[PDB]
Amino acid sequence: TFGRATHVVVRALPESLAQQALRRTKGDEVDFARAERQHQLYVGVLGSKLGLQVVQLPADESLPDCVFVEDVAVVCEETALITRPGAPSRRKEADMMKEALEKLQLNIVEMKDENATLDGGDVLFTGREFFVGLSKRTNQRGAEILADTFKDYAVSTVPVVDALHLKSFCSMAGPNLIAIGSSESAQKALKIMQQMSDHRYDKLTVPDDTAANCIYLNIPSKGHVLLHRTPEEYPESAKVYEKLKDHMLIPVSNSELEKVDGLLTCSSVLINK
Template identity: 30%
Template structure:
């Protein structure tokens, strides 16, 4: 893919939607072992929203936390927003009562002038191992008689936009059918599907990971990735399936590989411990290219939650310059 085809608004945002941390987050079953400090999580989330509002100058909407949903502060799960459109996702575990969150998010997105798109529940019959999504490659799942029909699933954490093309990770939450839905409704750019190496793991923490837990974009043409077996496996898929030559910077831990490129700045997770000191030495390799802004994330790192999951960042047709809360 040529440099000339780069999306002209890459990395430019004017709006964000986030949610405060609910009291119920400490009761989420998968966090019981880590026993996170609820008040520290709340403080770190408020710090992130403050940075977006005051330093990044984004118009920030804070959703009222939904106590029935312990994970309501992870709004990236709920939608993929691109070029004035939002695809509301259908990739969460069955039984998660997130309908109220999606209702509030939909109101907020419409308020910004974003067009709302809904996923159909099931895919039509598709050929075995489809190889193209808007010019990108795809890897199909096992099918019977050459046809598969299952609910479409996708979450925002599995959708990586580099400025030139999209990569979508096939994970516990995202499948090929969901990727095809995204490609058909959201973009004319190349969409390439890659697989996360989750098949052999029974660990809930491993299965809950998304593509952007391992790889993110630090600035135009530069990928940040986790220097782990899984991170290297995914990076190799990206390099092998892209016609654009990306530069790369490796991080020594998966949690540090997720950062956000916003309006010429790099927001990265500051864990406040030795892990951060190791990772910080890696991040310093970027200092000649981009200004870095640390985001407090010591408590979020204990529950292995990527920075980008905590907020939905996008370029809105219009903003209002006011803090808004949606019940």
């Protein structure tokens, strides 16, 4: 069953994130304390409320972006691909992720190709196939290694020209539902993805591109669950998600990490055992 998960890997925020974390725009100062509170609430939802077994990795001051675990690992069934981030400063993040996943007894595959780069944020897994964004963080060689690692799934690439990663404007919101931003760029990317697949996906358009990034889970005792941005952050988008009456909607804040280009999917890696 798509979206099913039993465990989730997360990582604590390092003090260095406030001023050293990578960001496309240097503007509003990050409130570290508040960022820690939002992370605590985020982890509380996944672990306490939804009952997932949480694996909490310690923060590393030398790795300002270590909180965004999604970018260093792509998991599909029992196999985990340890990526080679497009950002040199984030490559050491793979060390602790590899150890964590190996402890969970998952088939490990490392991206050692010195000419290949891939960020987990550029990978959209629909449960049926993979869509990989080609951006400044992920290249053709990286997409090729992904396709080789998960041979039982189709892999198609799509240009990411306006955002950091593919998931900066889309994510799965349900079994056959893709949440997508209303921007022309986001809509154009979705058209390309849909044209390459032989399966017709349903789409849920939201006014705020960054609000199109949500976390969908299928919990045995609750059913369809969706973590999305709060009404305070993006009221117009939260209102759209209200249409999903068969989903257990859970508002989750992430305003501080968004300052360093971090969205909801970025802070976790879901695994099903």
